[PDB]
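Ticket #4471: complex job returned nothing on first submit. Input attached below:
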Amino acid sequence: QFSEQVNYQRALEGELARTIETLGPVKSARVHLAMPSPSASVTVTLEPGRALDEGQISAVVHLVSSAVAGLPPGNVTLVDQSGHLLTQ
Amino acid sequence: QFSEQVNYQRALEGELARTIETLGPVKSARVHLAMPSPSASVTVTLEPGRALDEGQISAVVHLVSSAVAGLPPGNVTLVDQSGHLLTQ
Amino acid sequence: QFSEQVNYQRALEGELARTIETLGPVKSARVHLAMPSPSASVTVTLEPGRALDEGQISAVVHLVSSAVAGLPPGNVTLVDQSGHLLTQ
Amino acid sequence: QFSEQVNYQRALEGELARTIETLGPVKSARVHLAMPSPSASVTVTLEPGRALDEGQISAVVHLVSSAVAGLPPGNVTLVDQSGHLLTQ
Amino acid sequence: QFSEQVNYQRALEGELARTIETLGPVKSARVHLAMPSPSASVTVTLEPGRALDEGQISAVVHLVSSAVAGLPPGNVTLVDQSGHLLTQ
Amino acid sequence: QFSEQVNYQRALEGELARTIETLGPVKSARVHLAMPSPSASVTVTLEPGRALDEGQISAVVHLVSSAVAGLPPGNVTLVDQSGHLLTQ
Amino acid sequence: QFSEQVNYQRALEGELARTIETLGPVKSARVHLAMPSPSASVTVTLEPGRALDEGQISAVVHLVSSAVAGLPPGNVTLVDQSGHLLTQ
Amino acid sequence: QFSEQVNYQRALEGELARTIETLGPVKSARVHLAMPSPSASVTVTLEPGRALDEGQISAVVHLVSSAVAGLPPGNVTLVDQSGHLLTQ
Amino acid sequence: QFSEQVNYQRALEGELARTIETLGPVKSARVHLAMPSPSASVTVTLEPGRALDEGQISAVVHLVSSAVAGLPPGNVTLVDQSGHLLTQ
Amino acid sequence: QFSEQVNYQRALEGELARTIETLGPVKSARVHLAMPSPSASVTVTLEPGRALDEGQISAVVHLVSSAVAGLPPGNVTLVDQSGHLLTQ
Amino acid sequence: QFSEQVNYQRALEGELARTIETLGPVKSARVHLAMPSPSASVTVTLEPGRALDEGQISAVVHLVSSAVAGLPPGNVTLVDQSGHLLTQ
Amino acid sequence: QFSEQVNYQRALEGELARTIETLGPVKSARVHLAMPSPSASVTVTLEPGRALDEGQISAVVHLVSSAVAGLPPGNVTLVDQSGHLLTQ
Amino acid sequence: QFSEQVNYQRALEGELARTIETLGPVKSARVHLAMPSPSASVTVTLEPGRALDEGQISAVVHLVSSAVAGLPPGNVTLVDQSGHLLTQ
Amino acid sequence: QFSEQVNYQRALEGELARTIETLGPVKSARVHLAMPSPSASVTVTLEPGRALDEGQISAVVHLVSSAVAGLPPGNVTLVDQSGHLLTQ
Amino acid sequence: QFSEQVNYQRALEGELARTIETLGPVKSARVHLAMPSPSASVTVTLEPGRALDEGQISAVVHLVSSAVAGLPPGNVTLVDQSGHLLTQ
Amino acid sequence: QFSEQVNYQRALEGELARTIETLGPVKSARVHLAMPSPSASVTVTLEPGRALDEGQISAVVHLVSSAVAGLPPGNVTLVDQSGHLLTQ
Amino acid sequence: QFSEQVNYQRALEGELARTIETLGPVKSARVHLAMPSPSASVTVTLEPGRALDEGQISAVVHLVSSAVAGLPPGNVTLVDQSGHLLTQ
Amino acid sequence: QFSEQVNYQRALEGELARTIETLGPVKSARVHLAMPSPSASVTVTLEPGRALDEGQISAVVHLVSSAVAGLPPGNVTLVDQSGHLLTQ
Amino acid sequence: QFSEQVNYQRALEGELARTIETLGPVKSARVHLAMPSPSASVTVTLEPGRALDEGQISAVVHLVSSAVAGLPPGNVTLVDQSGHLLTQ
Amino acid sequence: QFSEQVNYQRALEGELARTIETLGPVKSARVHLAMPSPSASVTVTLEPGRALDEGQISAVVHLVSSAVAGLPPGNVTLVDQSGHLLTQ
Amino acid sequence: QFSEQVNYQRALEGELARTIETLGPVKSARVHLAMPSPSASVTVTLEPGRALDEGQISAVVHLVSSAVAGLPPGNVTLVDQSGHLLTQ
Amino acid sequence: QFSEQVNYQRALEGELARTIETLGPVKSARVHLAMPSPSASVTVTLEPGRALDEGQISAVVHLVSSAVAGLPPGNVTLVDQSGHLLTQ
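Support reply: We reran it on our side without changes. The output follows.
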């Protein structure tokens, strides 16, 4: 029963990261969820020579904040392939 | 029993995204639901050289807000293939 | 028991969309129901060079509002193949 | 037990629509019931070059309002093959 | 047990419609019952060049109102093969 | 148990109609019972060139009113092969 | 248990009608019982050129009123082969 | 258990009628009992050219009134082969 | 258990009637009992040219009144082969 | 258990009647008992040309009154082969 | 259990009558008991040309009154082969 | 259990009578017991030409009164082979 | 269990009588016990030409009174082979 | 269980009598016990030409009074082979 | 269980008597116990020409009084082979 | 369980008597115990020409009084092979 | 059940450390969680000739603080391959 | 369970006596215990020409008083091979 | 269940010590945990010619304090390969 | 269970005595324990020509007092191979 | 279950002693734990020609005090291979 | 279960004595524990020509006092191979 709600979360993370990949500047994403006040931590790896704008961050924040039950956008953490915590 | 209401949600998402594809400017959509106050996150990928108008957003918002039980249009999140969070 | 009331809803949607197809200007419809205050979202694809009039919308609204138990016509959402949310 | 009262409703709809076909101006009908305050939605397809008169609508309304338990004639919805919601 | 009181009603309807056929002006009848305040809806198809008189309607109304338990004659609905709701 | 009191009623109707046939002016009868305040509806088909007199109606009314438990003669309905409701 | 008290009543009716046949003017009788305040309905078919007198009716009434438990002579109904309800 | 007290009554009737046959003027009797205030109905068929006297009726009445438990002589009904109810 | 006290009564009747036969003027008797206030009904058939005297009746009455439990001599009914109820 | 106290009474009657036979004037007796206030009914058949005296009756009365439990001599009934109730 | 206390009484009677036989004037006795206030009834058959004296009666009375539990000598009944009740 | 205390009493009687035989004047005795206030009844058969004296009676009385539990000498009955009740 | 305390008493009697035999004047004894206030009855058969003295009686009385539980010497009964009750 | 305390008493009696034999003047003893206030009855058979003295009686009394539980010397009964009750 | 405490007592008696034999003047002893206030009865058989002194009695008394539980020396009974009760 | 505490006591007695044998003047001892206030009875058989002194008695008394649970030295009984109770 | 929530934590640690590896300056990470107020301890091994800036630490802190349920960023511990605790 | 604490005591006695043997002047000991206030009784057999001193007695007393649970030295009894109770 | 939370702790210790090895100056670590207020004891073995600085101790303290649930840094004990407790 | 705490005590005694042997002056010890206020009794056998000093006794006392649970040194008893109780 | 928490403690002791060996001056350690207020006792065997300093003792004390749950450093006991208790 | 906590104590004793052997002056130790206020008794056997100093005793005392749960150093007993209790 526990490996039921875990084999599922591992699929959500793999599905959520398949869309953020199909998003333009992102080359490959990697998201982990923390569903117990949940949280997430995207780890996008932007394409060579690119950088997400100030409104392109909320694109990837709300793309995950909304696809996960009860996850406000204040808990999503976005990080590049060069450190650089993009959220606040 | 849990994989009952999850194997179903995975089909809704795949059915909802099959209609948004058959919608003109959209080339391929990708929707995730967050049914626990539910939410959704469409990730349309518009056709080459196209952009959804201001009233073409509510088309795709209500197309999902209504096909999901108890989902107001204030929870649907629409995002292009170039970031650009279209909803508010 | 759950896949009982879901294998049925998937048939209603496929039956409701078979009639809206046999309706003249419509070439192919695609309806999803949201039976928990229910809702529906038709996605008609009008024939080449056609547009539903102001009274031809209530035709397709009541065609679905009445074929579904407890669904007022204020919850049915009609959308073309070019965005254009036709309902309100 | 549920597929008992559903395999039956699917037969009523197919029987009710077999009589409306044998009615003159109608070439082929298509009725769905909404038995939970029930409702119905006939979708007659009139013969080439024909139109139901003002008293020929109540013929098809009462033909269905009476063949279904507890269905007033104010819930039956009649629609042609050209939109044109005939009821009110 | 439910298909007991339904396989029976389907036989009553087929028996009631076999007598209305053997009634002179009628060529073929088609009756549905609505036993839950019950109702019925005969759909006689008169012989070529014929029309039921004002007292020939109560013949077919009471022929069904009486053959069904608890069905007043104010609930029976008679309709020709040309629309024309004959009852009131 | 239900098909017990129904396989029986179908035999009563077939027995009651076998006597009304052996009654002179009648060529073939057809009676349905409505045993729940019961009722009946005979559908005699008089011989070619014949008509039941005013006292020949009560013959066929009481012939059925008495052969059925608790059925007053005010509930029996007699109808010819030419409409013509004979009872009141 | 029900087909016990019905297979018996069908034998009483066939026995009661075998005696009324062996009664002179009667050529063949046909009696149905209505045992729930019971009733009966004899349908004698007098011999060619004969008619039961005023005291020959009570012969056939009491012949049945007494052979059936709790059946007063005011409930027995006698009818010829020419209509003609003989009782009152 | 019911066919116990019925297979017996059918034997009493056949035994009671075998004695009334061995009684002189009677050629063949036929008695039915109505044991629930019981009753009986003898149907003697007198020999050719004979008639039971006024005291020869009580012979056949008490012959049956006494051979049946709780049956007063005021409930026995005697009838010839020519109608003619002999009792009162 | 019922056919126990009935197979016995049928033997008493056959034994009681075997003694009344061995009684002189009687050629063959035939007695039925009515054991529930019991009763009996002897049906002696006197020898050719004989008649039971006034004190020869009480012989056959007490011969049966005493051989049956609780049967007073006021309930025994004696009848010849020529009607003629001998008791009172 | 009932055929226990009946197979026994049938033996008592056959034993009691075997002694009354071995009694002189009697050629063959035939006694029935009525054990529920019991009673008996002897049916002696005296030898050719003989008659029991006034004190020879109490011989056969007490011979049976005493051989049966609880049977006073006022209940024993003695009868010849020529009627003639000998007791009182 | 009943045929236990009856197969025994039948042996007592046969034993008691074997002693009264071995008693001189008696040639063969025959005793029946009435054990429920019991009673007995001896039926001695004296030797040819003999008669029991007044004190030879109490011999046979007490011979039985004492061999049976609770049987006073006032209940024993002695009878010859010529009637003649010897006791009182 | 009953044939236990009866197969025993039949042995006591046969043992008690074997001693009274070995007593001189007695040639063969025959005793029955009446054990429920018990009693006995000896039936000695004295040797040819002998008679028990007045004190030879108490020999045979106490010989039985004492060999049986609770049997006073006032209940023992002694009788010869010539009647002659010897006790009182 | 009863044949336990009876097969034993029959052995006591046979043992007690084997000692009284080995006592001189006695040739053969025969004792019965009456154990329920018990009693005994010896039946000594003295040797040819012998007689027990007045103190030789108490020898045989106490020889039995003491060998039996609860048997006073006032209940033992001694009798010769010539009657002659020796005790009191 | 009863034949347990009886097979034992029969051994005590046979053991007690084996010692009294080995006692000088006694040639063979024979003792019975009466264990329920118990008692005993020795039956010594003195050697030819011998007699137990006044103090040789208490030898055989106490030899048995003490070898049996609860048996006072006032209950032991000693008797020779010539009657002669030696105890008191 | 009873033959447990009896097979043991029979061994004690045989063991106690084996020691009294090995005691000098005694040639063979024979002791019985009376264990329920117990008692014993030794039956020593002194050697030819010997007699136990006044203090040689208490030797054999205490030899048994002490080897048996709860047996005072006032209950032991010593007897020679010539009567002569040695104890008091 | 009883033969448990008896097979043991028989071993104690045989062990206690094996030590008293290995004691000098004693040639063979023989002890019985009376364990229920217990007691013992030694029966030493001194060597030819020997006698236990006044303090050699307490040697054999305490040798047994102490080897047995709860046995005071006032209950041990010592006896030679020549009577002579040594204890007091 | 315990190895369920441990086999999972070991996978989280291996997944969390696979992303921190794909982060630029980090060559290989190694994270342990302390889920009972949880904690974590990353052990990044920076690429040859590199050092995480002051805002590149919060990148790796929030990358783990958010991917673990209920883990504040004040509990995450970051350490290089040269000691140097980077967090506070 | 009893032969458990007895097979053990028999081993203690055999072990305690094996040490007292290995004690110098003693050649062979023999101890019995009386464990229920316990006691013991050593029976040492001193070597030829030896005698235990006054302090050599307490050696063997405490050697046993201490090796047995709850045994004071006032209960141990020491005896030589020549009587001579050494303890007090 | 206990070897569940012990086979796990043995893995934590082996995992925690695998990271401290990959830390630069450390050549091989060895950590034991004391999870019941838990504790740990690292036993680092620094590389040849090296010594952990004052801030390089907190690196290894927090590396373990945080990877273990509920372990403050005041309980971690760090020790070199040359004694030298580094913590406080 | 008892032979559990006895097979163990027998091993303690054999182990405790194996150390006292390896103690110098002692050649072979032999200890018994009295564990119920326990006690012990060592039986050392000193080497030829040796004697334990006053402080060499407490060596062997405390060597046993401490190796046994709850055994004070005031209960240990030490004895040589020449009597000589060494403890107090 | 007990050998569970003992097979584990034996492994802790063997693991704790494997680290103290890898500590420089120590050549081989040997630790025992006393987990019930626990305790430990290390028994280090320093390398040839070495001695632990005053701060090198707390290294080995805290190395064990911390690796064992609930063991203060005041309970650890350190001892060399030359006695010399190093702790206090 | 008992041989569980005994097979363990026997291993502790064998392990504790293996360390005291590896201690320098000691050649072979031998310790017994008394775990119920526990105690121990070491029996060291010093090397040829050696003696434990005053502070070398507490080495071996605390080496055992600490390796055993709840054993104060005031209960440990140390003894050489020459008596000489070293503790107090």
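Chains N and H do not touch (no CB pair under 8 Å). Closing as resolved unless it happens again.
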